[PDB]
Every structure is written in C-alpha cells, then in structure tokens.
Amino acid sequence: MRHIGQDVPKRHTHFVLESRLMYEKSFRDCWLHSVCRAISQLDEPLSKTVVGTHQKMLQRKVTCFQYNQYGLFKTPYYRLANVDRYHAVQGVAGTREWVPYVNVSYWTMNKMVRGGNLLVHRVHYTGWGTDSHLKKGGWEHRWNKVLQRNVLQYSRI
C-alpha cells in the first residue's frame, strides 16, 4: 500500500475486484429486499388470513425490518460502474464504449481484436450482420428472440 511494491501496473484494477463483491452482495440481498418491498407497498389485502389491522401492522413491521438492515445492497445495476478486467478502462453500458459479451471497454476490445487475442469474425462495418434475427428487426428484435428462448418456450407449471 501507499505505492510500495505494487504488483500490478494499474492500481485501479483492484476496483474491478471490489465490483465483483458488489454483485455478490446483491445475490445475498436481492430476494430479501424485493420481498420486503412487495409486502410493504401492497394496498390490497395480503390474503384471506392476513387482513385489516394485522396487515397494516405487519407491513410497517416489515419496512421497519428492511430499514434496519445495515449494508443490505439496494443499488440498481445500471448505476454500478463498468470497468475492464484488463486495463481498468471504464465505459457506460448501452453505449458504444462498452462491449457486453466479453465485458470489456471499447479500448480493450480494439486492442484485443486487432492484435489477435479475441477470436471474432469481421463483418461489413455498415450493416446488421450475418445474423438472421438482427437482420430482421435490429437490436430490439434480437433482444426479444433471446427473451423468447429463455422464457416463453416453456409452459411453466
């Protein structure tokens, strides 16, 4: 510490590790958080069994419990910083400066693609691509088709 015997060339790479822990904290807190939200905000009766004064009471009890949880991770994902695992360059996701499937910044994607490190395939810079789905409706459509095979092809039970 205090720049004595530092192992990595960029110190900020460590931040990337910190980020990982954030996601970990979210896995630990998501279910809990969301349940406490849903039970708190519910105006209709909770159920046949819990109604009226009991329900009001229980609602307040729960949001009191949720406020008491120190360090519970409530931060929405789009507000977490995206930072490269390689050069610790940052980019805004949903922008052309962040590349989502490798999760690296434009700067690193460029460097890694041009000196061959990533295996990708070059496609004409101006179109939609080789891909059928993108060719049809662009980004939104492909987004949809991904939803369709993750979820909708199942008739859940």
Partner: protein
C-alpha cells in the same frame, strides 16, 4: 522449459537475393500496394475472369480469421461441382425436376 516448445524445428529460408520479378519498388511518387500482385491483376479480366479463388461449391471455403481472404477447410484439396450433386444432375441439383422453391411448394 514451457518455452522449449516455441523453438524452430527446421532451418528457416535465408534471404539470399534480390526482389522478385515485377516487385512494387517505389520511385519519386508511387502509390504502392505490397498486397496486390503486380502481374496477375494487370492481366485482363476478359481473359482471366472475375474469379479470385477456384470455382467450386463454397462449402469448401472458410472466411479466414485475421486475414482478409478465404481458405479451404481441407488444405488445398478441391472437389469440383460435379461431386456435390448426384451423377449427371441437371444444373447440379439434388433432383432434376425442380429448383429449390419448386421442390418446397410441390412438397407442400
């Protein structure tokens, strides 16, 4: 060493002598591609034909990684069109009766 792998097995060809026939060599102002073959592009399309690579069913070609060019997924072997279709297939075709769409809607 782990690196003992990256030694040269064979002695690499020396550079003994001069630039090849019709090399790109650039005088006072010359726009020079190292890339384009000087002699084989100058040669008329009328004669040589629009082909960049042998005329063969494209399944034999792969769009190369890192190189703008295609290569053959069996090094250098080539099977002619005749070997994709059945024997004496009209316009090499799985079956002679119809084109692809004709086959589809006949089937339907």
């Amino acid at each position: 060493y782990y690196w003992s792998r990256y030694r040269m097995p064979t002695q690499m060809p020396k550079f003994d002598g001069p630039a090849p026939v019709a090399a790109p060599q650039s005088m006072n102002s010359t726009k020079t591609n190292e890339f384009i073959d000087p002699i084989d592009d100058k040669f008329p399309m009328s004669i040589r034909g629009p082909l960049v690579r042998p005329d063969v069913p494209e399944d034999q070609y792969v769009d190369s990684w890192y190189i703008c060019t295609s290569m053959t997924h069996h090094m250098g072997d080539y099977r002619p069109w005749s070997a994709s279709a059945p024997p004496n297939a009209f316009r090499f075709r799985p079956f002679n009766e119809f084109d692809a769409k004709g086959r589809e809607y006949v089937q339907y």
